[PDB]
């Protein structure tokens, strides 16, 4: 299937407590593989996935140097936005960026992206064309014209279809044993009594990878997605994910309901009933 390389960067100021905290987290799908934290005892880019041990010392040296340049750059960014927005130097503010690319199973670029956010709201973003920008407000409009005159879109575009896609292939190659695997989910249902002759049925799905999965409760062959309660798929701390979906049914009629689980690791969807 398709794969992606994503980088989540966050810069947050803390007036009166020193420099802003700067962080970088990279993902090669749903698995964290690298990260940088300015709050570390000795800030440096470090592996977060075992297959990243395949990269030479130079890799970590280059990524660390770049991350450090980025930190200074974002420190200035926060100051700049204070002026764009005419804000006080005493409040904490946040800048968020997400950039990456996606490729099909053949490795060809499917899509590239880069969007900024200020204080939790959209700021500026690269359009799908990978040639122009879209500013959410007049502040982001100042940045748009700045990047336009500096030919930043060309630079970004070259990275997205260039370095981004190529290094994504290499990561998928080196960590194929990890990134290209499939862990079939293991499910089970729990039963909880309710004050009203009502029963709560919860379907649990664990130990699976990738993270994409579908859990839907049935009754008379009709999906009850409308009366379903769930939680977003979440990391289980070992590289796998888990999720659960529940439905409240009348006590005594729990046998008429079934939980259906779909996932790449399930040749045939799972069907569970209390």
């Amino acid at each position: 299937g398709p794969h992606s390389l994503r980088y989540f960067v966050t810069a947050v100021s803390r007036p009166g407590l020193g420099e802003p905290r700067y962080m970088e987290v990279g993902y090669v799908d749903d698995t964290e593989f690298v990260r940088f934290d300015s709050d570390a005892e000795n800030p440096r880019y470090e592996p977060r996935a075992r297959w990243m041990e395949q990269e030479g010392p130079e890799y970590w040296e280059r990524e660390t140097q770049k991350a450090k340049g980025n930190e200074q750059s974002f420190r200035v960014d926060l100051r700049t936005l204070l002026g764009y927005y005419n804000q006080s130097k005493g409040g904490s503010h946040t800048i968020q960026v997400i950039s990456g690319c996606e490729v099909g199973s053949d490795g060809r670029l499917l899509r590239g992206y880069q969007q900024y956010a200020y204080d939790g709201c959209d700021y500026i973003a690269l359009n799908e064309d990978l040639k122009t920008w879209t500013a959410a407000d007049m502040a982001a409009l100042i940045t748009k014209h700045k990047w336009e005159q500096a030919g930043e879109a060309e630079r970004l575009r070259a990275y997205l279809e260039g370095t981004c896609v190529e290094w994504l292939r290499r990561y998928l190659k080196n960590g194929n044993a990890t990134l290209l695997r499939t862990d079939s989910p293991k499910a089970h249902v729990t039963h909880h009594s309710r004050p009203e002759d009502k029963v709560t049925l919860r379907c649990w799905a664990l130990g699976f990878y990738p993270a994409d999965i579908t859990l839907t409760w049935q009754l008379n062959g009709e999906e009850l997605i409308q009366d379903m309660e769930l939680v977003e798929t979440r990391p289980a701390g070992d590289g796998t994910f888990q999720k659960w979906a529940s439905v409240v049914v009348p006590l005594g009629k729990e046998q008429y309901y079934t939980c259906h689980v779909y996932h790449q690791g399930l040749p045939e969807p799972l069907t569970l009933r209390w």
């Binding site: 690298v34 990524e63 750059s73 700021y123 500096a150």
Partner: peptide, 8 residues
């Protein structure tokens, strides 16, 4: 491989 971001 991460990107070297541009100033706002």
């Amino acid at each position: 491989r991460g990107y070297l971001y541009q100033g706002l």
